[PDB]
Structures are given as structure tokens and as C-alpha cells.
Amino acid sequence: HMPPIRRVNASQGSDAAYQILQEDGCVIVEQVICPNIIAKISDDVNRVMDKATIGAKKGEQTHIINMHNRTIHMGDLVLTSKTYRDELLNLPFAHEVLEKVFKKDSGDYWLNMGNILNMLPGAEAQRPHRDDYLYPVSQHMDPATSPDLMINITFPLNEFRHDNGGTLLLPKSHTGPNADFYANAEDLPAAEMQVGDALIFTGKCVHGGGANRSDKPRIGLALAAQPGYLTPRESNVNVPRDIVETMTPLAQRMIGWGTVRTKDTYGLNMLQDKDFHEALGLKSK
């Protein structure tokens, strides 16, 4: 028995989606965001896609997830899309789920990064994996009882179906032991969703990019968050301060322009022994 990927409408509330996430490691939330906001971000991303790196980043081994040259991953979204900074980073449903995930075990959270996922036509499926492999301490903790190190929220920017490589998932695989092999991609169900929906899954849920056998790119946007005590993959220190001060204090923290407190109350990312905002006199919306 291969468990199905379960779904809720965001009208049912964040408690119900969190419950499915706790039981399965993954949940699809239908109609979580106005599709026109997503289409706007999609246009911004399409404007600059010719700038992104194809395949591997410099020096990064590819064999763990099967990173290959029919895939484009692209960061730098804060400067690419104002709609991303102001609308997506502040989406209340997402923050309700993330606070439920992180606050007790870990404390404040922020982004690992925001990442465009472009599977080009003919893209081969990835090796099903756990995203928390990024952080080596995940290999020293029991998955059944350890805190979650990551939550991925993927918004399709065009329709996701099995045939165009929509994310493959292995529901209820988030409590088993860490392993070097979990499944073959061909045995997993795909997340099939429309623009305005989102897929949420934990850093322990087995998953991977699907095979794109259509003739059009399949593009999603991954809002990936983690405890503040883990180092983001993407820094935002090159974002002009004038632009940071048009963001809310929450979105500022998400992109690393803020102090993050552990569940024990201890501050990280402080400046001159004080709060980040206080030490800079940093303004916000």
C-alpha cells in the first residue's frame, strides 16, 4: 500500500492542514492564495530566467538528489519580485503552520531561501530524498522524535500534474530511520495542483522532483523555512537597506534582517549585544 497525498482547502483552516502534516509529513492546501498574486510573481521570475544557473551550483556534488542540466534552480527572489517581498513572505496561513511547527521545539524561524524550481522539458526525475540532509546534525538525531529542521511550501507557478513532473512524495515516510535509499521515483504519487494552491512538506518527508515528459517547463516556487539557529542557504545582506525598510518586521526577519530567538529565549543574529532592528535603527512597514 502506497498512501495517497491528502488535501485540504485553506478555508478549512491551518489547524486541519497542520494535522495532516503531522500525520503524513506532507499536505496539499488548495486555494491558499489569490492566483493573480502568483501569476504576477511568475511574470517577474520569467523576466529574469535567462540569468539563472543551469544544473549544479559551483562545487556542489549532484548525486544525492540527481541534480542535472535539465533543471534550473533560482534564488535572489527578494530583488526579483516586489510582490514576493510584500505578499508571499507575509501570507498568514503559511505563518500559522510554521509557528505550529517550530515555536515549541525550536523558537523563531526564518527562510533557508526562496527558490524557483524549473524542471525543463525532458527533465529526469530526482532521487527521492530528505531535504534535512542539508544539515549534518539531522543524521545524528532519531527522525521519530527529533525537531523538524525544515518546512517546504511549494507554490506551483503553472499547473502541476504527474506527467509534467509535479513533486513526487512518499506520504507517512517522515518518521522512519535515515537511509541512503528510500524509493524509486516511478513508485511515488505526484502532487497535482493548480496555481493558487500550495504543497507543504517537512524536511523528513521523502520526495523529489518528477520527470517532465511534457514539452513545457514545470515551474514552482519553494518557500523553505527553518529554525533561526540554522544558517540560511541564501544571505540577503546585498539587498539595499531602502528596500528592506519597505518590508514588514516579519518579512524582514524571514530574509535575515532581524534577530531570531531560540525556544530558550537566547538571541541569535544580534548586533552589538542588542536586537538587530534596535542596533541599526532599522525602519519597517
Ligand X SMILES: CC1=C2O[C@@]3(C)CC[C@H]4C(C)(C)C(=O)C=C[C@]4(C)[C@H]3C[C@]2(C)C2=C(C(=O)OC2)C1=O
Ligand Y SMILES: O=C(O)CCC(=O)C(=O)O
Binding-site residue set: 129, 131, 207
Residues 252, 283: Cα–Cα separation, whole Å: 10
Closest by CA position to 213, among listed 272, 263, 166, 144? 166
Nearer to ligand Y, 117 or 170 (CB): 117
Helix (H, G, I), strand (E, B) or coil at 156: strand
Sign of CA dihedral 211, 212, 217, 218: negative
Closest by CA position to 167, among listed 122, 132, 135, 119? 119
What is the size of the binding site for ligand Y (CB under 6 A)?
A: 10
Closest by CA position to 216, among listed 283, 168, 160, 254? 160
Nearer to ligand Y, 8 or 185 (CB): 185
For 193, which DSSP code?
A: B
231 lies in the binding site for ligand X (CB under 6 A): no
Q: What angle do the packed helices 92-102 and 14-24 form, to 10 degrees?
A: 50
Contact with a second copy (CB under 8 A) among 21, 26, 73, 219:
73
What cell numbers appear for 146 in the block?
527529533
User: CB–CB of 231/156 below 8 Å?
Assistant: no
Nearer to Fe ion, 131 or 148 (CB): 131
175 lies in the binding site for a second copy (CB under 8 A): no
64 lies in the binding site for ligand X (CB under 6 A): yes
**Per-residue x/- track, 134-173, ligand Y (CB under 6 A):** ---------------------------------x------
Give the helix ranges, DSSP H, for 67-168.
Answer: 77-80, 82-86, 92-102
- Please, which of residues 60-79 interact with ligand Y by CB under 6 A? 65
Count the neighbouring beta carbons within 10 Å of the beta carbon of residue 245: 14
Residues 2, 184: Cα–Cα separation, whole Å: 13
171 lies in the binding site for a second copy (CB under 8 A): no
What cell numbers appear for 236 in the block?
540577503
Q: Tell me which stretch binds ligand X (CB under 6 A): 21-29, 77-85, 107-115, 273-281.
A: 107-115
The set of residues, in sequence order, having a beta carbon less than 8 Å from that of 32 and lying 6+ positions away, is 10, 91, 93, 94, 196, 197, 198
Q: Tell me which stretch binds a second copy (CB under 8 A): 26-34, 128-136, 165-173, 186-194.
A: 128-136
Nearer to ligand Y, 126 or 259 (CB): 126
The phi, psi pair for 238, rounded to 5°, reads -85, 0
Work out what residue 209 binds among Fe ion, ligand Y, ligand X, none; the CB cut-off runs from 5 to 8 Å by kind. Answer: ligand Y
The phi, psi pair for 253, rounded to 5°, reads -60, -40
Nearer to ligand Y, 145 or 265 (CB): 265
- Please, which of residues 119-138 interact with ligand X by CB under 6 A? 131, 133-134
**Per-residue x/- track, 90-119, ligand Y (CB under 6 A):** ---------------------------x-x
Nearer to ligand X, 12 or 184 (CB): 184
226 lies in the binding site for ligand X (CB under 6 A): no
- Please, which of residues 260-279 interact with a second copy by CB under 8 A? 260-276, 279
- The residue ranges that bind ligand X (CB under 6 A) are 56, 60, 62, 64-65, 67, 112-113, 115, 131, 133-134, 152, 222, 224, 233, 266
